[PDB]
Amino acid sequence: ALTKSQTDRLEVLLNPKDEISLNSGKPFRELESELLSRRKKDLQQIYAEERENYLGKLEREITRFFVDRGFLEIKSPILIPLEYIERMGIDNDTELSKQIFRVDKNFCLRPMLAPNLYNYLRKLDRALPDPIKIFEIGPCYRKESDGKEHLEEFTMLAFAQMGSGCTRENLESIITDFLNHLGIDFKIVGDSCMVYGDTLDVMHGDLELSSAVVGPIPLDREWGIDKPWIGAGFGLERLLKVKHDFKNIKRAARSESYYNGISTNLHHHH
Amino acid sequence: ALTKSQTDRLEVLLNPKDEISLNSGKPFRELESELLSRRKKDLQQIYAEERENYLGKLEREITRFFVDRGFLEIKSPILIPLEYIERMGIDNDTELSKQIFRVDKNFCLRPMLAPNLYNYLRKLDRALPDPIKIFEIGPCYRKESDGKEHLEEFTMLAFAQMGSGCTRENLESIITDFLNHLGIDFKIVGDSCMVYGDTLDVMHGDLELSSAVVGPIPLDREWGIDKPWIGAGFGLERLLKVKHDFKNIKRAARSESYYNGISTNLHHHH
Ligand SMILES: Nc1ncnc2c1ncn2[C@@H]1O[C@H](COP(=O)(O)OP(=O)(O)NP(=O)(O)O)[C@@H](O)[C@H]1O
């Protein structure tokens, strides 16, 4: 019989592709030695051939998709004014407000990309022709409880279009083209949302890949937006979790503990 | 005569390529209208053709260079334990320690990439063949005074090699190949450093592009490293400042105020 500590250690070393059962009755050291050997070989192969990090590679793939479809690539601050949170209509007694990492007294780590993209839409509307199409990929931060679907440090893609063409049909068509490109099956379900009102949730089984919005909405006035728009946000670690059939999203995160879903802690357990 | 407010506004709208002088005696509105028209056209052209963000594009170019030369692409946490700072030998009464953005009580925004790369070197040495070559590009954070060479939110590349081949000659040769690839002239100057001891500073005129280190050093013991190593760190916004002849590094930063060095604030000044 394996202890809980031994089972947890084997789970860290097990990968989705492995045809190995921890409930097979084999001794711990036998299972551990096989898995350590497989993971070392996996890392050696990555190092010998591709050498690309899954999160970096997916960002680059996504960037090419959106650039090629006419969207401007934005890189905006990660450390943002706390005032942008309140201006998103997030009251400081709300659950989301309690998820914010504060920095100093007046700043925070962004929990979402919307504020910066709202400002870019307003500014670019003075220079660029209709429709204005932008996107951003980068780190976002939320305090979360320990779970297999959430990270405190994650990576979000968000895109937005403003002006003509800002229909639910076009929004769903962009989402469909994007997730087809990635080879990810999904469905769309309507839900309510305290920030945006009603959303379209992009679901893979019970896992939310994205929330999307058809504007205009009452919040727009606070950002100086008065045109129709559509937009969506996606978690890159969730996309990787689906693509690679990871059991826990930690396998896809910025991490010291995993490289492309392979444990970096390859010591023997005693 | 132009007021200081008017001169500052024209400086924001002026780009290095412009053959326009603010000291020419022309009225403010004439200079402002010409510059606004040039910047709008610049943004329109970016939107019509390349659509790539300078910081994103440079990260991708750098990533390809290092991956193709056998270095593993790392993406590690930006929000790190405050204990890693002390373990770098940064005492809490030192000037660098005062530059750290603290988060919660026990975390901070990373001011450097070295701690995470030290841990990756230690772990990967159990799996990968000699020499171990890794790199990371991403956000770093330091409190700074207002100046044209420093950002509080910047982007660092750091690479390291550990094992064989870890000579000053090989380090300089990698730096030279890299900066040749980018088309940036430089010189190397020795300096002292409280964290690493002696460094090699990679200079473009009076601007430090990088600091580099030939190990081993006494700090290595604290990270479980006992082999020779070489490494260097570079600021991407500084590389862009040199490449594009920006007068202030803010033009190259993650920003709401500039897109590829072009002002996003294209209103009229009254
Ligand atoms: N903590 C997190 N970890 C990983 N991905 C996240 C996290 N929070 C949000 N995302 C991703 O970002 C997308 C847009 O954010 P948002 O719609 O606000 O998330 P959410 O409604 O809080 N999702 P959930 O907490 O699973 O019910 C989500 O659909 C996820 O793909």
Ligand SMILES: Nc1ncnc2c1ncn2[C@@H]1O[C@H](COP(=O)(O)OP(=O)(O)NP(=O)(O)O)[C@@H](O)[C@H]1O
């Ligand atoms: N505040 C900053 N803004 C932009 N780039 C930075 C900043 N701090 C460091 N870098 C870059 O990161 C590289 C490695 O960091 P490090 O050697 O610690 O910088 P440094 O010695 O503090 N440079 P300096 O402050 O100009 O004397 C530097 O050579 C810069 O290219």
Ligand SMILES: [Mg+2]
């Ligand atoms: Mg949530």
Ligand SMILES: [Mg+2]
């Ligand atoms: Mg949602």
Ligand SMILES: [Mg+2]
């Ligand atoms: Mg400094």
Ligand SMILES: [Mg+2]
């Ligand atoms: Mg230095």
